[PDB]
Structure formats: structure tokens, C-alpha cells
Amino acid sequence: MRNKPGKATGKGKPVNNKWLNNAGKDLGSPVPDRIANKLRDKEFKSFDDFRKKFWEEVSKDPELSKQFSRNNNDRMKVGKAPKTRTQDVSGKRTSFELHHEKPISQNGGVYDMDNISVVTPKRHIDIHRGK
């Protein structure tokens, strides 16, 4: 399912000036309701496609982009996720990741933004108990 096309849905949530502040704990940071407004009802080829588009919208949002360094904004401008602090990386996984709260393998929505959150590699791995 993850690699099959779908339409984005979901409301997301309003975020403040420290959006990814809690990306290293619990379920991490929600999809901003501003980003969801831009992606909602849009068709994607695969989750990876959504992923790419998700970060591009982040670089286009005046309030969201300002919370990142130039280097991370440049990355997001081309669909690449922002790099985390060294403390939060794990091997080749060095940038913020998107997690599905309810696993796609368990009928979880692939493009349901209310089922998607932003987490650090380190936290994502702990969420999946080591993977």
C-alpha cells in the first residue's frame, strides 16, 4: 500500500514557532494545519512522493521555513527532509522522518495527515522498538 498512489486527507494541527521541538518524544510533531491545507485533496504516486511534496510545502510556508537554517531550507526546497542534530541521527538516517501512527500494515491511512507525524530517526526507531 505504501507505494501505491492515493489522495491526501486530514486537518493537521496549528503549530507555534517551535514546531519540531517535540520531534524526539512521544509521537513527535504533527502535520501543520497550514501544510495540510496545501496538500489536502491532492493525488500522490507513493508515500515517498507525498514525503517530497510535504517538505517542499514546508519550505514555501513563511512561518514554518523561518524555524530552519538556510541549509535545511535549501534541502526542503527540493523535497529533502531537514537534517537533525547529530544526537538524533542513526547511521544513514540523518534527517527528520514521517511516522504513521496507525501502521499501514494495520489499515492505517497512507496519506492521512492526521495519522502522520514528524519524528527524529532516534525516536522513530524507538517507536518501532528497534527498527
Contact set with a copy of itself (CB under 8 A): 90, 100, 103-106, 108, 125-131
Nearer to Zn ion, 76 or 118 (CB): 118
Answer yes or no: is 76 a known binding residue. no
Cell of 13: 494541527
Which residues is 100 bridged to in the sheet?
116
Out of 93, 100, 123, 129, pick the active-site residue: 100
Please choose which of Zn ion, a copy of itself, none residue 123 contacts, taking the beta carbon within 5 to 8 angstroms, the exact cut-off set by kind.
Answer: none
**Burial track 66-89 (b if 16+ CB lie within 10 A, e otherwise):** ebbeeebbebbeeebbbbbeeebe
CB 70, min distance to Zn ion, A: 29
Q: What is the dihedral of CA 21, 49, 6, 119, to 10 degrees?
A: -20
Please choose which of a copy of itself, Zn ion, none residue 86 contacts, taking the beta carbon within 5 to 8 angstroms, the exact cut-off set by kind.
Answer: none
Which residues is 95 bridged to in the sheet?
83
Please confirm, yes or no, whether 34 is among the known catalytic residues. Answer: no
Nearer to a copy of itself, 66 or 131 (CB): 131
In whole angstroms, give the CA distance from residue 43 to residue 111. Answer: 9
99 is a site residue for Zn ion (CB under 5 A): yes
Terminal-residue alpha carbon distance, the chain = 19
CB 36, min distance to a copy of itself, A: 22
Please confirm, yes or no, whether 128 is among the known catalytic residues. Answer: yes
Please confirm, yes or no, whether 124 is among the known catalytic residues. Answer: yes
Active site residues: 2, 99-100, 124, 128
